[PDB]
Each structure stands twice: as C-alpha cells, then as structure tokens.
Amino acid sequence: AKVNLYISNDAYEKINAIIEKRRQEGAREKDVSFSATASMLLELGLRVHEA
Amino acid sequence: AKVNLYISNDAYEKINAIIEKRRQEGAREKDVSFSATASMLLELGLRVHEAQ
Amino acid sequence: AKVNLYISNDAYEKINAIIEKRRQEGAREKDVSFSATASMLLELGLRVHEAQM
Amino acid sequence: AKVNLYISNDAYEKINAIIEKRRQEGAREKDVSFSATASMLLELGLRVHEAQM
C-alpha cells in the first residue's frame, strides 16, 4: 500500500543523519535511502506498539 | 515534511487494526486517521532506534 | 521458564520508579509486580532486537 | 541487584537463537552467554520504555 507520513523537522534531520552515518560506515550512496530507513523506523514503532 | 512511503500489507493491516481498536474504545472517526496513526508510529520508531 | 539475573543498580531503580508511578495511578497486584514488569521489559527488548534480524 | 523473572518458552528459545546468531556473526564461545544477552535485552526494553514516554 502507499501512504503519506507527516514527520517533524527533527525526525527529518535525524533520518538524514542515520543515512549519512551508514555512508561514513561504508554504505554506497545508492545502497541506502530515506524511504527504506523510514520503513525500518515505522516497523520499529509498530513492534513497540504491539508490545 | 511529507514522506510518501510504500508499506507492506502486514503494516497496512496492523495500522488498520489499531485504528479499529481505538474506534471500539470510543474514538470518533473524525479524530482518527491512517496518516496520523502511521506518522506517530514513525516518530516513536525513531526514538526507539535512538535507544538502541 | 524461571530466570535469575543480576541487573545494574540503575536499571533496578528505574523499574522501581515505573512500579511506583503505576501505584500512584491506582494499579495493584500484577500491575505493580517487579518481576512481572521486568519480564515485560525483557520481552519488549526482544521484540525490538528482532526487527534487525 | 538480583531479579527473578518468568519468561515464556518462546522467549527463552528466542534468546538461544540470538546466542547462536552472535557466535556466527563475529563473537566467541563463553561470551554471549544467556544471562548477558537477557540482561542486555532487559536494559534495552527499559530504554525503549523510556522512549514511549
């Protein structure tokens, strides 16, 4: 399914910092993405909520 | 910022179940939103990621 | 399964503070059990860790 | 501080699998013991619980 999220300025910067950190640790620019990262964080939120 | 995201059928269903539970607990449909629910779950997930 | 564990003083104090908060919210019995709360936290940490696997 | 926890058979099993996956991903024997992992998951769960707040 395709959904619109609306996130804070803070969350936007933090997700960008996650990606920058992965790159510094060796990920190629094309191997990481804002949207893949946001998916991973959405999944973490769902897991925590279900618990 | 708006983030348009493809999500799995699992997540879609799970977010829908959450909305449904809230409605069953008394929430008005007008104060309920897929987008709002998912957005808050992402903000939570970011805090959880920082906790790791 | 019953599990014996030594945790940090800081974690111990934090779990004690969670229980005292609940107590002030009118919680009783299992809702204020140290053991039961610690078990729920261990399960929570497990569900989280599983997301990266 | 010493704690006594009840955990489900399912939870207990999952901890073992963590142990195994670690010993296959840059870790050694004796280390990644059950307790160390359990304790790590409990303190994670505590930090996760502080994040829900």
Side-chain angles (χ1 to χ4, degrees), chain A residues 1-19 21-27 29-51, chain B residues 1-27 29 31-52, chain C residues 1-27 29-46 48-53, chain D residues 1-22 24 26-27 32-53:
Chain A
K2 189 201 302 178
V3 308
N4 295 309
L5 308 192
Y6 302 99
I7 71 173
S8 61
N9 285 342
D10 182 52
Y12 173 77
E13 282 176 0
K14 278 172 171 167
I15 291 171
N16 271 334
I18 287 168
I19 292 168
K21 178 182 177 57
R22 294 208 193 279
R23 295 193 61 197
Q24 185 172 315
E25 286 160 353
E29 187 167 31
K30 313 191 73 177
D31 288 341
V32 282
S33 81
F34 196 97
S35 57
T37 301
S39 285
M40 180 270 194
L41 301 167
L42 177 53
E43 171 70 17
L44 279 183
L46 274 171
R47 279 172 181 266
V48 171
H49 184 85
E50 293 181 56
Chain B
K2 175 182 69 171
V3 178
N4 187 250
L5 202 58
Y6 291 103
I7 64 171
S8 70
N9 294 323
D10 185 41
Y12 182 71
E13 290 170 2
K14 280 180 190 161
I15 292 166
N16 278 341
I18 291 177
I19 302 272
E20 176 181 359
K21 180 188 180 187
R22 314 265 185 88
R23 296 277 281 119
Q24 295 177 358
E25 299 175 323
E29 187 185 358
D31 315 329
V32 126
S33 153
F34 196 97
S35 171
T37 302
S39 299
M40 300 188 192
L41 288 169
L42 177 145
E43 303 282 343
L44 167 64
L46 179 60
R47 297 200 300 284
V48 174
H49 174 89
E50 305 181 313
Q52 304 187 255
Chain C
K2 182 70 163 307
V3 171
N4 280 356
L5 198 52
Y6 291 75
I7 67 177
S8 63
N9 294 325
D10 182 49
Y12 177 79
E13 295 164 14
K14 297 280 186 49
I15 299 174
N16 280 333
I18 291 167
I19 299 311
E20 174 53 34
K21 176 206 52 194
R22 285 182 189 168
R23 178 95 60 178
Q24 298 204 6
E25 290 166 342
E29 313 181 42
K30 177 171 185 302
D31 296 324
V32 300
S33 159
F34 188 102
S35 291
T37 302
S39 290
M40 161 257 119
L41 291 166
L42 171 55
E43 296 256 355
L44 173 55
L46 191 58
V48 158
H49 190 261
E50 281 174 26
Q52 300 317 109
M53 296 171 55
Chain D
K2 190 184 184 177
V3 301
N4 309 114
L5 301 199
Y6 288 97
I7 66 172
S8 62
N9 177 76
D10 174 52
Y12 179 87
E13 286 176 349
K14 295 287 307 192
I15 316 303
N16 284 341
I18 300 292
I19 296 174
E20 276 284 344
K21 188 168 189 169
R22 299 267 216 94
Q24 302 307 121
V32 82
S33 60
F34 183 93
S35 293
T37 292
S39 168
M40 191 232 71
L41 286 170
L42 172 52
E43 293 188 331
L44 177 50
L46 214 46
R47 296 192 307 272
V48 169
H49 181 267
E50 308 279 0
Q52 296 168 273
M53 305 296 89

